[PDB]
Amino acid sequence: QQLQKEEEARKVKSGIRQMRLFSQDECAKIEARIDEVVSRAEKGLYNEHTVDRAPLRNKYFFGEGYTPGQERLYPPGDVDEIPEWVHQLVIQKLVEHRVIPEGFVNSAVINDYQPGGCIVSHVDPIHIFERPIVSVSFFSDSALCFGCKFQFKPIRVSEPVLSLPVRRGSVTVLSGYAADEITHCIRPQDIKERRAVIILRKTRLDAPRL
Template sequence: MATAFPDLRDKLRAGSGGVGSAGECGEGGRKRRAEPASEGEEDEDEETGVESPGADEVARKVQSGVLQARPFTDSECERIEACIDDVVALAERGAYKVRTVDRAPLRNKYFFGEGYTYGSQLVKRGPGQERLYPRGEVDPIPQWIYDLVIRRLEERRIVAKGFVNSAVINDYLPGGCIVSHVDPIHIFDRPIVSVSFFSDSALSFGCKFSFRPIRVSKPVLSLPIAQGCVTVISGYAADEITHCIRPQDIKARRAVIILRRTRINAPRLDPSCLPELPDHLTNRVRRPDKRESPSVRRSSHRKASPYEAHRRRVLAMDEEADKRALVLRTPPYPDGTREHRSDNSPPRSKRPRH
C-alpha cells in the first residue's frame, strides 16, 4: 500500500466528497484555518517560552500532510454516537474479549479487527518494539462501523475500498489525553484516518509532555477538530512529527474512531509470548451470550453512561486523594500528637509507662 499512497492523496484532493486541507473542519463544521502557535504567544502550559527555529516551516510541512472533511450530518453523528454508547455498555457487561478493552483513567480504548502491544505492555521499550496480537485476540470490527462510517468514507473517496482492517474507539472524559506519539510505522500503513464524535476538540503536533503534575509544551500546530469531522494524516504529519490530544482540549466527553490498515509484514506476537493481563482483568469472565447484535438499530433510547466505564479508576483516585487530605488536616503538633485541639489548650500529658 505504501507505493499507492501518493495516488490516494491525489484522489483525496481531487475528490468531490468535500475533502479539504488542514484546518477546514473547525468548530461546528465551519471552515477554520489551523494556525501554528505564533511566536511569543503566551501559553500557561508552555515549558520554555522559546519557540524552536523553523517552527513555521515545520507547521507548513504538517499542514501539507493533513486533510479534513465533514461527511456526516448531525443526525448521522447522533446515530453513530448511540452505537458507541452500545459498545461502552457491552464492554461493561463483559461481552468482549479481554484484549479488546483497554482501560485508563479518563480514557478507554476498544480494539476491533487488530490489537497491538504498546506503552507499559511492551516487553522491551522503545520505538519499533510494538507487536500485533495473535489473530483472534480482539473482537472483529462491528458491522455498524462498516455500515455507518467506513462505507461513507469509501463513497466520498476518503479511503480506498477495502483499505481498513483495524478500528479503535478512544472514549475520553473531560481532562483525558493521549501523550505525544507516532502511530507505529512498522505496524500501520498510511494514511491514518480518524472520525471525531460527541464534542469538539483539537489535535496537536510536536508537543512534549511532563508529569507530576502533567504539563504540555506549546504545539507546533494545533488543529481544530469538530464533531463529525474526519481527519486524514500522512506524509510528514504521520511519520516525522508526534501528535497528541492535550488534557485542556477535552472539555466534554469525546470519542474518536481511528481507522487504519495493518501492514502485511507487520510483526506479530507468538501466542506463547502474550503479555500478562492487568490485575483488573485477570478474573474477568466473558459472557458469550451477551454478544453485539448485528443490527445497527437501537432497541432502547436509554444511553449507557460513559462515566461507569471509568468509575473504578476514578473511585480509586478519589480514595487516595481523601487519604492525603486526611493527613493534611491533622498535622503533628510540637509534642508529637495529632489530636485536634484549640491553640490555647495545653497538650495532653503523656501517661507514664510502668
C-alpha cells in the same frame, strides 16, 4: 526560530486533510452505537484484548489490536471483529467519498475520553500501520496537537508546533510528514467534555506479531 516554527507547521499541514463528512443526525446514530460498545464491554462480552481501560480514556480494539517502538500485533482472532455498524455507518461513507479505497481498513479503534482526558506525545506505530491514518470525531469538538515537546519541556517550549481543530463529525486524514516525522497528542484542557474518536487504519503485511 520563528521561521523554523512556520516551516514545520507548513510541513505538518502538507500531511493533513480534513472534511466535515457526518451530519448531526448521522453523528447521533454513531454516538448511540459507541454507547452500545461501552455497554457491551461492561457486560464482559468482548475478548480480553479488545478492551483497554485507563483512568481518563478507554480504548476499544476491533479487527486488529496491539500492545515504545516494540508494539506487537495480537495473534489472529484475539480481538473482536469490526462491528457491522462501523462498516455501514462509517467506513462506507469514507469509501463513497473517496477518502480511502474499499478493503483498505482492517483495524477500527474507538478511543473514548473523559473530561480532562489526553494522550501523550506519540507516533502511530510505523511498523504496525500503513498510511494514511483516518480518524472521525464524535461527541464534542476538541483539538489535536502536533510537535509535543511542550508536554515534557514547558519552560523551553510552551506550545505545540500546530494545533488542529477536530470538530464533531469531522474526518481527519494523516499522511507523510504529519504521520511519520512529527509526534501528536491531546492536551487535557482541550477535552472539556466527553469526546470519542474512531480511528480507521490498515495493518502492514509484516507487522510483527506476538
